[PDB]
Amino acid sequence: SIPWIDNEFAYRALAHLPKFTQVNNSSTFKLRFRCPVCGDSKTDQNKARGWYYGDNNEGNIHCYNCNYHAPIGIYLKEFEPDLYREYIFEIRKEKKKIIKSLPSCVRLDKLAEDHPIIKYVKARCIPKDKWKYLWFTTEWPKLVNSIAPGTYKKEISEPRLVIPIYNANGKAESFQGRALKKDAPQKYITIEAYPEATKIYGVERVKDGDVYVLEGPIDSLFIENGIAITGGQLDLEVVPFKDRRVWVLDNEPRHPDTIKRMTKLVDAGERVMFWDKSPWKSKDVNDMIRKEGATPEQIMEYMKNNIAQGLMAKMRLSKYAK
């Protein structure tokens, strides 16, 4: 198919749609908009469940409200035949910033031992030394607007735990804020100094031997050579130590997305971790530590004797499925 011309035609046709958004990352062409087929959610007028994907082999539209999915050509012919004919004829026609200041931030290692967040991190059972990499803020929106103005409409006083993300050079080019309260718009609000900032945590702290890729940076704290891809799309290329890295996901065997990711990793022949014999059964490492009492050295012992790759990984995954 012809992705670029389809993307252009979809852009022309859907420029006028409600909630139209040009959600285009560095490698994908997605358009977010309110689904004209169903008007998206009747209750929520700000929902834009109409999505066009040009990254797909053929730019395809799908609504998450009316569950209407089709190619761009089908929608164009069934809704705008006028430009559809011109498009179908065209078918054969073609034929960096570094964060330097920490306003309203007090590092946990230098924070007072009586601070409530210190007590919470004790409930989180984080190693004391790791506190020299985490700050606490009472003015997270204020701090972000001080560093990146216009981010927050109001600089409300919100206490969060700020983990700066240091590049291999050790330069904080981003930061993730964890809301202390159980209720929040997002558990981990991550803001980067520049769009090309590193999405991998602990890169500056990588040592010799195998490197363990985890989910949460706090989880990586308990682990030597623990790096954390800070959200985003899992891309092998952006990940260093492509020779020696070790994949460690959450212990959620019945969860479908986790096993999908693990299948993706193993099909790339990677070296992954398996929990099919773990004495603890919590979802993640920190949960095993705080609940099952799991201690980090036992965890490392288990993991160094549970890494599998290739056919070994595949067969050990089959059993771990369910």
Binding site: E252, H255, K322
Partner: protein, 432 residues
């Protein structure tokens, strides 16, 4: 009370043996309870015994479920515990819960039926019952009690059988004594009775005469005609009942005054039923069509027939068969089986007609091997009759009946009785 039901299924043999055969997965919920009951039912199917807690939470729950379903099932299984309750209150409460859940499911189903039928065609979700069969679903939901009624025990149910014998609550007597002395009281309710006559020998004079007799006997008669219009069949019935020749109604020798007088004389009699004639195109009506017609008659005209007369069995179509078959053996047999199933479902005496083979034409005797369309039709019929008036009986206004297959009695007792046909009045009279 799902938790109590599950707990006493696991931890009570008497309660299990009492309530398990009436348990269904569509009674508990769309969450943990349904999954737990699925595990229990799978274990009972596989091993014919009630599972324990270990079997539930290891041998069965360690299979395939999402995280939320797994957590719910684990919590429910851990919550199960034996509780001392009387085994008369538990059964009654479980029966009430089952009845309530059956009613809830039936209400949801009929709501979905109405919603589906409200939608226009091409999106009507076929195989879903029509709006006509809403009350039967509710009636089925009402009778969902825990009573053991599987079949007819010979020794345990002889009282009801004797009541049926003494009441004779299966026979529908004829108006002809000759047909009653060979059927031992007439035809039975769930039966398929057949006439075989040939071409222009009868085969609708006989059906019309039987319909007229049943009408005079107070029965509701439904005449489904595939080969004749409603008006011509009603004219034959009028000739039979008004004692007027069929030609006289055509030439015009009968006045409107006497016609209306005879009709009103018949109306005032309390011993007169209702005859409804419905025509379908030749080859365009099946058992499903007849069921739809019955439902429409019951809803609109409040008409529940006791006699159903199909003018011709061989020019109908099979509801089960989807692709037309050139083999007349299978199609006619399927049609006859469907008609007899309809008769036994509606408890209606079903009369129909069959065509004899060309060899039997102008033959003084017609054997069962002269059936034309299919040899499976005589196997499914409860009573067959053959009309063999060749040449001399026509001059004497007679017809000879052979009694080829008789399931009401011995067909070798009174094989021939020489019925008195009258073609002008379209009726049968005896030779007493």
């Amino acid at each position: 009370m799902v938790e109590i039901i599950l707990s006493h299924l696991i931890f009570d043999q008497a309660y299990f043996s009492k309530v398990w055969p009436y348990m269904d997965s569509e009674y508990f919920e769309s969450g943990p309870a349904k999954n737990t009951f699925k595990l229990i039912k799978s274990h009972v199917n596989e091993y014919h015994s009630v599972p324990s807690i270990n079997a539930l939470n290891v041998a069965l729950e360690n299979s395939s479920f999402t995280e939320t379903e797994y957590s719910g099932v684990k919590t429910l299984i851990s919550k199960l515990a034996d509780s001392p309750e009387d085994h008369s209150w538990l059964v009654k409460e479980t029966e009430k819960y089952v009845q309530q859940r059956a009613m809830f499911n039936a209400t949801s189903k009929i709501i979905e039926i109405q919603t589906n039928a409200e939608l226009p065609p091409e999106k009507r979700n076929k195989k879903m019952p029509d709006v006509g069969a809403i009350p039967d679903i509710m009636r089925q939901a009402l009778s969902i009690s825990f009573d053991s009624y599987v079949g007819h025990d010979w020794m345990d149910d002889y009282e009801a059988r004797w009541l049926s014998y003494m009441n004779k609550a299966r026979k529908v007597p004829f108006k002809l004594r000759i047909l009653n002395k060979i059927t031992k009281g007439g035809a039975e309710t769930g039966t398929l009775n057949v006439l075989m006559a040939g071409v222009n020998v009868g085969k609708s004079l006989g059906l019309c005469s039987l319909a007229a007799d049943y009408l005079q006997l107070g029965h509701n008669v439904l005449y489904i005609s595939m080969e004749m219009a409603e008006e011509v069949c009603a004219k034959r019935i009028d000739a039979n009942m008004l004692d007027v020749s069929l030609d006289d109604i055509d030439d015009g020798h009968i006045s409107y005054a006497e016609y209306k007088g005879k009709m009103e004389k018949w109306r005032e009699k309390s011993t007169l039923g209702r005859l409804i004639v419905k025509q379908y195109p030749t080859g365009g009506a099946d058992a499903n069509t007849f069921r739809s017609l019955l439902n429409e008659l019951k809803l609109k005209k409040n008409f529940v027939p006791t006699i159903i007369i199909v003018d011709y069995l061989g020019i109908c179509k099979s509801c089960r068969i989807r692709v037309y078959s050139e083999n007349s053996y299978t199609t006619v047999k399927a049609i006859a089986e469907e008609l007899r199933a309809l008769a036994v479902e509606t408890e209606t005496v079903l009369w129909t007609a069959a065509q004899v083979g060309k060899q039997a034409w102008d033959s003084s005797d017609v054997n069962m091997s002269d059936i034309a369309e299919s040899a499976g039709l005589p196997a499914t019929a409860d009573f067959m009759l053959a009309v063999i008036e060749t040449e001399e009986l026509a001059a004497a206004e007679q017809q000879l009946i052979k009694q080829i297959k008789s399931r009401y009695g011995d067909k070798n007792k009174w094989n021939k009785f020489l019925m008195g046909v009258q073609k002008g009045n379209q009726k049968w009279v005896e030779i007493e």
